[PDB]
Amino acid sequence: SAVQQKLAALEKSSGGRLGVALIDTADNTQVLYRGDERFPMCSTSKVMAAAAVLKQSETQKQLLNQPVEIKPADLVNYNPIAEKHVNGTMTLAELSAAALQYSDNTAMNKLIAQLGGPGGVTAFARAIGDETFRLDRTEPTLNTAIPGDPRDTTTPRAMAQTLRQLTLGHALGETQRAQLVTWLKGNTTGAASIRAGLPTSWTVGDKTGSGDYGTTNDIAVIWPQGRAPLVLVTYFTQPQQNAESRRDVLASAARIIAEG
Numbered sequence: 479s480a481v482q483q484k485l486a487a488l489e490k491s492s493g494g495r496l497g498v499a500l501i502d503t504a505d506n507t508q509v510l511y512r513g514d515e516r517f518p519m520c521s522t523s524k525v526m527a528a529a530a531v532l533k534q535s536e537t538q539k540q541l542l543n544q545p546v547e548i549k550p551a552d553l554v555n556y557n558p559i560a561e562k563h564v565n566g567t568m569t570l571a572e573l574s575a576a577a578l579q580y581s582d583n584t585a586m587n588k589l590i591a592q593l594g595g596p597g598g599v600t601a602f603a604r605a606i607g608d609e610t611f612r613l614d615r616t617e618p619t620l621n622t623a624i625p626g627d628p629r630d631t632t633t634p635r636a637m638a639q640t641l642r643q644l645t646l647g648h649a650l651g652e653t654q655r656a657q658l659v660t661w662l663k664g665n666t667t668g669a670a671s672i673r674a675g676l677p678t679s680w681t682v683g684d685k686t687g688s689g690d691y692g693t694t695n696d697i698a699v700i701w702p703q704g705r706a707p708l709v710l711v712t713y714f715t716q717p718q719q720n721a722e723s724r725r726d727v728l729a730s731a732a733r734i735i736a737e738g
């Protein structure tokens with residue numbers, strides 16, 4: 479198609495590997511580019527961990543208000559919110575919000591511990607029909623993004639379909655779904671990614687991700703003005719291990735998609 483030739487040209491000029499998945503809920507049509515290839519998820523996997531804790535709250539009505547202790551041993555490489563509460567407590571809701579809106583890695587590790595390990599996060603993916611998502615490690619080793627390594631990876635097609643069920647579908651209860659959407663809309667880290675390639679009047683909720691090998695990711699649910707919402711996943715990785723982040727590639731991919 480026309481958009482696939484532009485995405486192919488964008489990939490060639492960037493020197494990396496680009497994966498795009500678009501789901502238009504107006505007619506369930508999909509636009510895919512390397513949609514079945516595996517990409518390192520990096521911090522984009524935090525949406526699955528937060529959604530799994532939300533599913534547990536459909537039975538445990540007061541789970542989101544449960545206090546969790548933040549000890550100095552719990553801090554990893556990037557904990558902007560958790561460092562403000564060392565030797566104190568954060569609720570599971572505050573931890574889910576920190577992991578999603580600020581990409582706090584300590585909050586991610588606390589959510590994984592609540593689910594009984596990385597196997598508990600992967601279990602929630604299988605429970606809602608995601609046979610591709612796999613979480614194998616905790617923060618921060620899950621971001622190694624080694625080429626060929628299947629660990630901590632998914633495909634663009636699978637993540638776009640799963641993200642649609644979590645935010646627009648009914649994989650979660652009504653109250654939990656609205657909480658997830660509200661958290662995604664209040665993200666603070668995606669101004670230069672998918673949001674930068676879309677019109678300013680469009681409301682966007684997203685989760686970014688970065689890692690080694692220049693891995694630059696962003697997944698988003700998009701609400702156009704007076705139009706059926708969209709779900710767009712953009713994954714990108716590079717050959718050099720110390721390659722810089724390329725958030726402009728994600729913005730350009732979103733612009734190419736939004737032209738159609």
Ligand SMILES: CCN1CCN(C(=O)N[C@@H](C(=O)N[C@H](C(=O)O)[C@@H]2N[C@@H](C(=O)O)C(C)(C)S2)c2ccccc2)C(=O)C1=O
Binds near residue numbers: 622689
């Ligand atoms: C060998 C172990 N090892 C290797 C891989 N790795 C990482 O990939 N860390 C990454 C990391 O911890 N990224 C954070 C994270 O994992 O949510 C935050 N997520 C990004 C995002 O949401 O867009 C951020 C840019 C807001 S930082 C990282 C990437 C670029 C610059 C600094 C840190 C590590 O730091 C690490 O411990």
